[PDB]
Nucleic acid binder design. Sequence first.
RNA 1: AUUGUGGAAGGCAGCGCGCGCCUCCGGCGUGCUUCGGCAUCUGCGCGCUCCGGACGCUGGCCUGUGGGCUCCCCAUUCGA
Lengths: 205, 177, 201, 111, 132
Amino acid sequence: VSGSGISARRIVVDARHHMLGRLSSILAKELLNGQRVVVVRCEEICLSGGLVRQKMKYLRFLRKRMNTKPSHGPIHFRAPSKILWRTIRGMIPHKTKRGAAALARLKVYEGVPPPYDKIKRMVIPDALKVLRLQSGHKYCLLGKLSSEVGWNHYDTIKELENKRKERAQVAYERRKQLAKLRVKAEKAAEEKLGPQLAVIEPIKY
Amino acid sequence: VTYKFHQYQVVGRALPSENDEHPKIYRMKLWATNEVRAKSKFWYFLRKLKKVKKSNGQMLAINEIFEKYPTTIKNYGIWLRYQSRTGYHNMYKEYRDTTLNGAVEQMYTEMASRHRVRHHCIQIIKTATIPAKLCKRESTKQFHDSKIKFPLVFKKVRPPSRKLKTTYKATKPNLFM
Amino acid sequence: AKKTIRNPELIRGVGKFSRSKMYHKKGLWAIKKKNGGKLPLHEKKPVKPPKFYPADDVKKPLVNKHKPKPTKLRASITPGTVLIILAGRFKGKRVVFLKQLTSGLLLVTGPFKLNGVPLRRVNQAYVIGTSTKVDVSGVNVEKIDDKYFAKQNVLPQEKKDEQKTVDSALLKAIEGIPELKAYLSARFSLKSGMKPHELVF
Amino acid sequence: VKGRQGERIRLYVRGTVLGYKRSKSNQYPNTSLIQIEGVNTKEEVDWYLGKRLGYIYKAKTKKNNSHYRCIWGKVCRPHGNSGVVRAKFKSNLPPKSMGAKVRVFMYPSNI
Amino acid sequence: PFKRFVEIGRVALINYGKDYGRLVVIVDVIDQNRALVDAPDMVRSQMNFKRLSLTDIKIDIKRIPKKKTLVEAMEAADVKTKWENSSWGRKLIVQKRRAALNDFDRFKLMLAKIKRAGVVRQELAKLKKIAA
RNA sequence: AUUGUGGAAGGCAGCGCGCGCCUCCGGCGUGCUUCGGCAUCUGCGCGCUCCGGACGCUGGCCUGUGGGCUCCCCAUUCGA
Ligand SMILES: [K+]
Ligand SMILES: [K+]
Ligand SMILES: [K+]
Ligand SMILES: [Mg+2]
Ligand SMILES: [Mg+2]
């Protein structure tokens, strides 16, 4: 993984059905190359091995604590967004200034809060479950894992996501109708544009 | 075009002596990655099977054997002897390939996978082109169907070349059998 | 005397014919007869007091046998070819290639009327030769050379008229090709997703 | 229509400064690793070999009536298999430039 | 119910490697991972299914046919015409055409697209005021 | 892509043009030849070249907000 190398002011990633570790490594490289990344819907991230194995792993993590002063760490974040953030931190030299700056360019959210609900969201094929996990093998959602280890906002995110999706469906229908109104416009413009369509014909899909 | 393993006929004999001016000529069909390694394994067997070491032997001829019809599919049976972690065993394997070189390559790959047997712990006893009606393994029989038909259950999604590779895409892959 | 080279070169520094063949072609056998059976022998081709003596002996550099060769012209660039300027104040503008000067630089014209680029010298390393060709048969630039662009501000009226004479013959050819006038009036630029190493010119 | 104010023609592509030529335990600042946008293979790198590079940054003081500074370089050879290149500059780039962008010009031109 | 199956006569597209973009016919199946493919302009050879994309075209041939028999079968089914006329097959052709446009051709296409967009936008405005 | 160390030598090597004619992408004389060819005749004069280690051209700038710096403070990546 060398990096995307694209010039963008900001990249918004939809993490739904992305493998946690593979998404983390790709994003870690993007952040280290100076790319600003926003990750939404972290509760829908997928972890291979299944809930039982992943739950046992987190419980072993909960055991780790400074015996003489538990407040001195390690800190066991329960929310999906923080778990992703901590997973990425393990793949970055976060104790150096270079690493700290890279982490400061990352933002993680559960669900899709504004203004990102109206911003195009991309996916990362190298981390997609449909391409990385064989159908029939165990996996769990990060939101489900977080709920069982002490994240109590799962329902709140679920209701807000349903409200957002219904609004998005309404907006989708408006664009769908606007597209049907535009295919008529081009047909009407066909008579005016005789030479222009000839040039575009060999290039049109 | 290119094969990992090549088949050679190696012909050799013991050095002529006053008692035997015309010693017996021995031939073997050996598999190796090149001629040099084919010769070395030829003397290994002659030393241990005919008591003729290379120091007192003579190399006569070495020729590579090529598949006759590399465009058709044949069923290949391979009789082999191999060493496990606790002893020696004999097994018979079948493969389907356009050339016996490919079938032998599959055999070495399978032995490494299913038995953790390295290349140097295998001796090929016999090879042959088996007709379809005389095959024994079901992995080979199930493809003896004039109406062979099945879908591609697992596909590999990727651009034709890395030139069209991008880290980010607007939509997920659309896959259907 | 001989009108053509006796020994054509298969490659640089290797002739097509051997020494034995060349002896026949050189005619040394004929020359030997005319000179009493002998090749004629020829003969080898036969201040002010200083005002100051240096304390240190002067050192003169050793002889170098390498001689510079004329700058080569890129195969993509042919007379009438449309070039894209990659640097300078005229970066991105599309000009018409006229000829190569003795210095190795390229002589180009906008033409000045279409894009405001006059008769100018552009280094070959800072241009891209496209596949578009505009006829320049009627263009006469035999009067133009390196000295025409040499320094010695108001541009003399003489050069403005010279620009128009060359320009006028070129406008008619440009007007013949549809949409070529607008093509030469717009600068080339890279947009999103445009990869220079994949662009065809 | 946008009404944007800025450069009207772009005759360069952006490249990201990834770091220096290095091993697991040593660093060689005299060579820099640059990722050129759009170049994803070693074969595609051949077009950019020898191309001039410009690292433009802003200083606090004014020199020649400007806060901009430029360090020039060029593409020397490819690095790896994924289109990364090795670049040399008149002076070694500072570590501060890691993650910054450089301009990859289309000259000197061989086409 | 699956739409495409690996079978003798199935036309497949090479989706990876040097042979990318070419059409081949599956004339025999070696195993689960490999098939024997043949095309008019290539020698019969094996290749992995990971480099093949099955199409909707399927000619009627017997197992491992002769080249002359294979060629006439493809022409009888208009394999090349069907593929190029299909939307999927046209995508590959258009991609090559776009990459092959020279600087002048791209300028002409820009003018046509700009003029096409301007007229279309005017038509939409009328469809908005009238058909609100 | 990196690089020009040397500053006494026009040397060494391979060729070209003249010193004989022709219709000039070539042709014309001995010896040898595998019949394609050949260091068999191939000397002198004047030149050329992948030939005893880089030369040439152009611009910028020259008391400036310029150039240089081994000095000072500090930041960052690597090392420690
Ligand atoms: K050089
Ligand atoms: K100065
Ligand atoms: K330091
Ligand atoms: Mg790396
Ligand atoms: Mg020197």
